[PDB]
Ligand binder design. Structure first.
Ligand SMILES: NC(=O)C1=CN([C@@H]2O[C@H](COP(=O)(O)OP(=O)(O)OC[C@H]3O[C@@H](n4cnc5c(N)ncnc54)[C@H](OP(=O)(O)O)[C@@H]3O)[C@@H](O)[C@H]2O)C=CC1
Ligand SMILES: NC(=O)C1=CN([C@@H]2O[C@H](COP(=O)(O)OP(=O)(O)OC[C@H]3O[C@@H](n4cnc5c(N)ncnc54)[C@H](OP(=O)(O)O)[C@@H]3O)[C@@H](O)[C@H]2O)C=CC1
Ligand SMILES: CN(Cc1cnc2nc(N)nc(N)c2n1)c1ccc(C(=O)N[C@@H](CCC(=O)O)C(=O)O)cc1
Ligand SMILES: CN(Cc1cnc2nc(N)nc(N)c2n1)c1ccc(C(=O)N[C@@H](CCC(=O)O)C(=O)O)cc1
Lengths: 164, 164
């Protein structure tokens, strides 16, 4: 399956800050549309706790070293490496895997080179402080821009890159 | 005069990395046009050394605490706050000031809220390590997207933002 990263950030590359509601209405609807199409989302435990509940119409895979039994078929607490995660979803018939976050989770998939496309939303802000897209890692990735789209009047931008 | 930031970065927000030749010539020509139109470039001493010499047809203002007299009329070593630099250039009839870089210089101008527009080029890469656009500072800036332009088939993107 191909791995797709889905994230929103400010112009400086941060995925979280203390700025209230900087995430646009448009990015939120675009996010639901994209991830439901893919049919699954892989996230870190901390990101799951912030969302608070499983996202509807999608298989929610939550990474945690303290797996918890689940009563919901669309919620799975998983203890494994990025590679293990991809194998598990592939075994479910998914062609694409949507990794939606946790700086920690983005970092792990990057260190392991498991990323084929980046669906990036750039919100019109500059945050002086915040949580970076990922922690330092050796190497880099050349990209190719597949699509660019303005999502609203203020300038929220949706970019789609393929990893070369 | 209004302060304009001109920078190129990868998708993760870094203005420099160990990767060779990641700067596109299209960005370089676009940079040449914009900065010569503005007529001046304000930069940190390190950036100056890396460029290798005064950029032609532009007043080059090199920020430094250890000032050196200059023979060249279009090269000035300046010691002072970002506010003093603007004052100095305004006194010379400039309406716009082009701050072209150095993580330290961008940080200083941001801390002082002296910035009106951002002329940002996003090169199609993700760097694992590198120098960030700026070091932490208090607050943030909401922006409005004025213009978006693709510079090459690979995906180099030029974005123009207004502050606040
Ligand atoms: N702007 C955006 O688009 C997004 C922003 N975010 C933001 O980023 C922050 C979250 O980032 P971050 O805290 O780094 O990461 P996460 O919070 O998403 O998850 C961290 C945790 O996930 C678990 N985990 C990670 N990797 C593995 C693995 N290989 N195996 C098992 N468990 C694993 C661990 O859980 P345990 O401790 O249980 O063992 C770890 O504590 C939040 O502020 C959130 O708002 C999140 C998504 C998107
Ligand atoms: N991608 C891009 O668009 C750009 C990338 N860069 C990259 O970023 C790096 C440069 O970042 P960084 O080193 O932080 O900064 P700079 O290299 O631009 O400048 C550092 C210097 O500027 C001087 N300086 C800074 N603030 C002041 C002040 N308030 N008053 C007086 N002098 C001051 C100091 O001079 P002194 O010590 O002599 O007194 C210091 O040595 C380089 O690797 C370069 O390649 C640079 C520009 C653009
Ligand atoms: C905090 N968080 C993480 C979050 C937010 N925006 C993002 N935006 C992008 N582009 N990418 C991400 N990974 C991302 N992650 C959240 C919080 C809520 C919902 C959420 O309610 N979900 C609805 C969205 C729908 C709405 O507002 O209709 C969904 O069903 O997908 C998703 C993610
Ligand atoms: C390392 N450096 C800093 C540099 C490079 N690209 C950037 N690109 C952007 N968008 N913004 C910056 N601040 C920036 N800074 C350099 C190195 C050379 C020249 C340079 O030769 N100058 C010619 C360009 C000429 C060409 O290729 O015709 C110029 O007249 O501006 C400029 C900046």
């Amino acid at each position: 399956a191909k791995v797709i990263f889905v994230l929103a950030m400010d112009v400086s590359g941060k995925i979280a800050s203390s700025v209230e509601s900087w995430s646009s209405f448009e990015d939120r609807k675009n996010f639901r549309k994209i991830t439901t199409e893919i049919g699954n989302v892989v996230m870190g435990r901390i990101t799951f706790e912030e969302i608070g509940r499983p996202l509807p119409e999608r298989l929610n895979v939550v990474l945690t070293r303290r797996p918890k039994t689940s009563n919901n078929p669309s919620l799975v607490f998983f203890n494994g490496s990025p590679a293990d995660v991809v194998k598990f979803l592939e075994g479910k018939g998914y062609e694409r895997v949507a990794v939606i976050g946790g700086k920690t989770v983005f970092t792990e998939f990057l260190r392991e080179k498991l990323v084929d496309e980046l669906f990036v939303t750039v919100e019109p802000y500059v945050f002086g402080k915040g949580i970076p897209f990922f922690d330092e890692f050796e190497g880099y990735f050349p990209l190719k821009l597949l699509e660019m789209r303005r999502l609203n009047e203020r300038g929220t931008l949706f970019l789609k890159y393929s990893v070369e």
